[PDB]
Design a binder for this molecule. Sequence first.
Ligand SMILES: CCN1C(=O)COc2cc(N(CC(F)(F)F)S(=O)(=O)c3ccc(C)c(C)c3)ccc21
Ligand SMILES: [Cl-]
Ligand SMILES: [Cl-]
Ligand SMILES: [Cl-]
Ligand SMILES: [Cl-]
Ligand SMILES: [Cl-]
Ligand SMILES: [Cl-]
Ligand SMILES: [Cl-]
Ligand SMILES: [Cl-]
Lengths: 244, 10
Amino acid sequence: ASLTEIEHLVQSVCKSYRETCQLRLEDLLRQRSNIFSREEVTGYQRKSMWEMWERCAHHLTEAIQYVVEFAKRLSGFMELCQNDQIVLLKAGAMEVVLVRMCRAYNADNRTVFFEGKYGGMELFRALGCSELISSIFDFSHSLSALHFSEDEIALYTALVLINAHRPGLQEKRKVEQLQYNLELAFHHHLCKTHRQSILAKLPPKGKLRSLCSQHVERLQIFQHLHPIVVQAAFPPLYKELFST
Amino acid sequence: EFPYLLSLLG
Ligand SMILES: CCN1C(=O)COc2cc(N(CC(F)(F)F)S(=O)(=O)c3ccc(C)c(C)c3)ccc21
Ligand SMILES: [Cl-]
Ligand SMILES: [Cl-]
Ligand SMILES: [Cl-]
Ligand SMILES: [Cl-]
Ligand SMILES: [Cl-]
Ligand SMILES: [Cl-]
Ligand SMILES: [Cl-]
Ligand SMILES: [Cl-]
């Protein structure tokens, strides 16, 4: 791939992200001063596990839908075979949402944007998965420290998705080449913007892996406690991606 | 195994 093709790929990826980012950074920043009151927090903590799970599954599914759109608009993704598109999305859609989450995280007061206001991790108590919630917040805190630009998160999330080391790929060489060109694009962009030092500071892989693994484990626990709710109320896509 | 994911790809 020539330097011109790599430069155009940076632009392409940034545009695909812009078109599917689902919440404007400017809006998210502006709403930091909108924080749940004590009574509102109590209301969430008193919610049934069922209702809180059901709400979060809806919101996660919505985010995952934007990531599928990102993938479909991503240079070279629709060139991959059906099997590979599925394998990359099944492994990577959740990882991308988790990275995207740092936009909706405020490190000053350790809040996340949820259903229109910012709250702390105490908001999620009824979920009954304290370790997972704390790990998500830790992950966001660690990303906040990188202070990603929009362009950086676009290029980085492209790479989270185009990962040729995912098990079950048919056209591994094809995915390797896509990944490599995306690395070129990421590196070109970072060099130009004097940001290459951040590469060495990115979350280890296995950090994202663990978060996704924990999500799957907690869902299995919930589904065994409330099997009817999942089949009745959860999005089919969510069940397909995360159920056993 | 993944028809609902496959549908959104179309
Ligand atoms: C509970 C299982 N879970 C995870 O394991 C992965 O992290 C998640 C994210 C989201 N979001 C999805 C969207 F943010 F992307 F929209 S959320 O409903 O606005 C939300 C925001 C923040 C928190 C802490 C939670 C708990 C939820 C939903 C579910 C999970
Ligand atoms: Cl709660
Ligand atoms: Cl829903
Ligand atoms: Cl992937
Ligand atoms: Cl924010
Ligand atoms: Cl995060
Ligand atoms: Cl950030
Ligand atoms: Cl993305
Ligand atoms: Cl640099």
